[PDB]
Design a protein around this ligand. Structure first.
Ligand SMILES: O=C(O)C[C@@H]1CC[C@H](NC(=O)Cc2cccs2)B(O)O1
Ligand code: NA
Length: 266
């Protein structure tokens, strides 16, 4: 259709590979572009990671204090690295993992799921439990960013991650109370002003989880509400693998992709 051609023009203009998935609703068709193609998760996994922790524990667990050392700061950790002396509660870790993409928080929450591979296996299994047979997490931060194009490790697809997020925020994967916490953390995200948010009019609400990696990898997964309160899930994934491991990620690609989506859903 014409929208596919426009996504293709966007890819050509940015010298990038773009993936888009907006699940169909009772009133709207799905928007799909390279939606069954694999893209690195990057920091986007930190949102479903928080859902896994929520899922597996009573809410009182959020008050559990976790201590760690400066040697645990092995990845970009804007919150955790300033709380080595105090520790952080599981809830604070969930907050940081989503709103600041905190990698140490992510690793600690992975550990909290238990089992081999520092909780990476358990994370993947959580996604399996939501019907996702595609996504896989194989390493902790930062080593999960190291995989070259073509390697299936630490990848998802726009389709798979969109349907995960759909079930988590809009569906019944979580009880409404836990769902509200996940939603609130994504709502107050600090990292996403220049991506999906930048492509929707100000009277639309946007909650989201960003990620950035090597090979120009830039993702955003969002739930948006129209001015009338109609929700949609918008997953946008990109890389610029053609330019090499140090290709510049382009936030503006995601904003423009989201603009194209907002045009269809207005
Ligand atoms: O939310 C965002 O968009 C940024 C977030 C930062 C932590 C994670 N990145 C890393 O830890 C290393 C990186 C490689 C290339 C860039 S940062 B994550 O994937 O992305
Ligand atoms: Na500190």
């Amino acid at each position: 259709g014409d929208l596919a051609d426009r996504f293709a023009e966007l890819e050509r203009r940015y010298d990038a590979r773009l993936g888009v998935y907006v699940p169909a609703t009772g009133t709207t068709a799905a928007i799909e572009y390279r939606a069954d193609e694999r893209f690195a998760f990057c920091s986007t996994f930190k949102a479903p990671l928080v859902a896994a922790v929520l899922h597996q524990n009573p809410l009182t667990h959020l008050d559990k204090l976790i201590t760690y050392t400066s040697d645990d700061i092995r990845s970009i950790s804007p919150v955790a690295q300033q709380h080595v002396q105090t520790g952080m509660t599981i809830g604070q870790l969930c907050d940081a993992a989503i709103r600041y993409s905190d990698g140490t928080a992510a690793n600690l929450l992975l550990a909290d799921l238990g089992g081999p591979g520092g909780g990476t296996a358990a994370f993947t299994g959580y996604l399996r439990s939501l019907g996702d047979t595609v996504s896989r997490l194989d390493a902790e931060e930062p080593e999960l960013n190291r995989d070259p194009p073509g390697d299936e490790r630490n990848t998802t697809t726009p389709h798979a991650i969109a349907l995960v997020l759909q079930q988590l925020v809009l569906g019944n994967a979580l009880p409404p109370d836990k769902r509200a916490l996940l939603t609130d953390w994504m709502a107050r995200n600090t990292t996403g002003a220049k991506r999906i948010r930048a492509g929707f009019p100000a009277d639309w609400k946007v909650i989201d989880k960003t990620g950035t990696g090597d090979y120009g990898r830039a993702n955003d997964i969002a739930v948006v509400w129209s001015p009338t309160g109609v929700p949609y899930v918008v997953a946008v994934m990109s890389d610029r693998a053609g330019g090499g491991y140090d290709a510049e990620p382009r936030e503006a690609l995601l904003a423009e992709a989201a603009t194209c989506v907002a045009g269809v859903l207005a």
